[PDB]
């Protein structure tokens, strides 16, 4: 296959503005959320059709639970931090879980926590061991490094239990998720300031998201400097890009295995 | 979905003996040991996540994640260690599925 | 560490009967199971967290109160016969696979 992911991110917030939720936890396969769950709700809800077609009541009820459960242990887990840091005010805790399954077969697997928008702790499965940014993150490193069981549980969730979750919902999604649309790609020329052309590269109604462009002169990489276009969301499921260069010249778009050349 | 484990087993004092349990699951997430003695509350023995073998003092707990299987290994076997044992296996939805317990007699 | 009350009961059929259940650990997480020979412990329901409650494997005759962080209560509104079992309690924190910290027991005899 293609490179497909599955993560799921945690977000609390202390003394929240009215109108903003103490606690949301978002799922994610590749670019796409496919669940949902926030402190006003209080339910695990889909956030994609292809996962409310698939997964039965029975798995929207039991992760609500944990949710609700998990929803509870944030909010003492950041009273904690900001215990430590002598904190007031509101402030901001992360959690970001999940796996790759690469296109060759292997696997990534990471587990990241945030305090303040800022990397806290990062989990290192290959060793069973939470990199500390600082001496707050620290204390908490060497309590969570004290629960031997729990590391090696969360190394099997991120090697196995993960990637399962992801090809599962992969097969859910597939009409989706496995879909190509090709990019449409032009040249655009203008003579901006007296004496500056430039070119620019532009591509849409692409899905996925991934594409490479460039610009090359007489089949070889520019000497000079190309301004990047963000990969944007035109609303529609599809993906819209650029890239440009100033003033013999070609745009390459390589998109899902197809490579393309725009002379000019 | 199903956890097995053999109904009883019988063993002599000082020898060794092997509980076996097997389980067919939707996700794992860790296997469990308690200890139940007759008319008593179960109380843990041990967890394993990782494939491998975990012993602690007479009782070693073995866990092999592509076989689907797990054992409770006792030395040195003691009148004291008649008791049911309980395997139990969290799944991918987090529930603990019991097994109905393996009721171990030990002949002195 | 967990505290569950009456070790033993008699019932008559239709009386009303709470189980009470307290645990000292900090403990998020609370269940209620029962244990009837020849199968594994069944729960009844569970409590993920303080102010939530969900039905377990057999929940059809019984109801559950989490009163605080501590206290979570079986009740058995109109006793029946195969309510006759042996309830457990228990507790641990709200990983998903942290062990779980069991009480004494509770043999409930439900008679004509």
């Known amino acids: 296959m293609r490179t497909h992911s599955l993560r799921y991110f945690r977000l609390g917030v202390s003394d929240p503005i009215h109108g903003v939720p103490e606690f949301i936890s978002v799922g994610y396969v590749d670019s796409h959320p496919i669940t949902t769950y926030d402190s006003v709700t209080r339910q695990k809800e889909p956030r994609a059709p292809w996962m409310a077609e698939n997964l039965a009541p029975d798995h929207w009820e039991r992760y609500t639970q944990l949710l609700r459960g998990w929803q509870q242990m944030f909010k003492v887990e950041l009273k904690r931090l900001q215990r430590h840091y002598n904190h007031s005010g509101s402030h901001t805790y992360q959690r970001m879980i999940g796996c790759e399954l690469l296109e060759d077969g292997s696997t990534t697997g990471f587990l990241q926590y945030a305090y303040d928008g800022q990397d806290f702790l990062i989990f290192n499965k290959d060793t069973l061991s939470w990199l500390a940014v600082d001496n707050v993150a620290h204390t908490i490193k060497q309590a969570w490094e004290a629960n031997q069981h729990e590391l090696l549980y969360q190394k099997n969730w991120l090697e196995e239990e993960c990637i399962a979750w992801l090809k599962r919902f992969l097969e859910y999604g597939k009409d989706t998720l496995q879909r190509t649309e090709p990019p449409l790609v032009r040249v655009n020329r203008k003579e901006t300031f007296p004496g500056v052309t430039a070119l620019f590269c532009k591509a849409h109604g692409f899905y996925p998201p991934e594409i490479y462009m460039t610009w090359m002169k007489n089949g070889e990489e520019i000497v000079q400097e190309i301004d990047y276009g963000d990969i944007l969301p035109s609303g529609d499921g599809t993906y819209q890009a650029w890239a440009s260069i100033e003033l013999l010249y070609s745009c390459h778009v390589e998109h899902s295995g197809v490579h393309m050349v725009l002379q000019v | 979905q199903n956890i097995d484990q053999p109904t009883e087993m019988t063993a002599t004092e000082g020898a060794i003996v092997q509980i076996n349990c097997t389980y067919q699951?939707?996700?794992?997430?860790?296997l469990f040991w308690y200890q139940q003695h007759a008319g008593e509350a179960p109380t843990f023995l041990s967890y394993?996540?990782l494939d491998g073998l975990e012993e602690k003092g007479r009782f070693s707990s073995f866990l092999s994640r592509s076989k689907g299987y797990s054992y409770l290994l006792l030395k040195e076997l003691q009148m004291k260690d008649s008791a049911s044992y309980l395997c139990?296996?969290?799944?991918?939805?987090?529930?603990?599925?019991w097994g109905a317990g393996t009721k171990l007699i030990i002949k002195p | 560490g967990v505290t569950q009350t009456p070790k033993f009961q008699v019932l008559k059929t239709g009386q009303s009967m709470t189980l009470q259940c307290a645990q000292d650990?900090?403990?998020?997480?609370m269940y209620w199971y029962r244990q009837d020979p020849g199968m594994g412990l069944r729960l009844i329901y569970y409590?993920?967290?303080?102010?939530?409650?969900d039905k377990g494997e057999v929940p059809n005759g019984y109801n559950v109160s989490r009163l605080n962080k501590r206290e979570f209560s079986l009740r058995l509104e109109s006793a029946a016969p195969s309510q006759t079992s042996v309830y457990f309690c228990?507790?641990?924190?709200?990983?998903?696979?942290?062990?779980?910290?069991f009480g004494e027991g509770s043999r409930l005899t439900v008679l004509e």
């Open positions: 139990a296996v969290v799944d991918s939805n987090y529930q603990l599925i």
């Open positions: 699951t939707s996700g794992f997430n860790g």
């Open positions: 394993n996540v």
């Open positions: 650990m900090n403990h998020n997480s």
């Open positions: 409590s993920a967290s303080e102010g939530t409650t």
């Open positions: 228990a507790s641990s924190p709200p990983g998903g696979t942290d062990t779980q910290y």
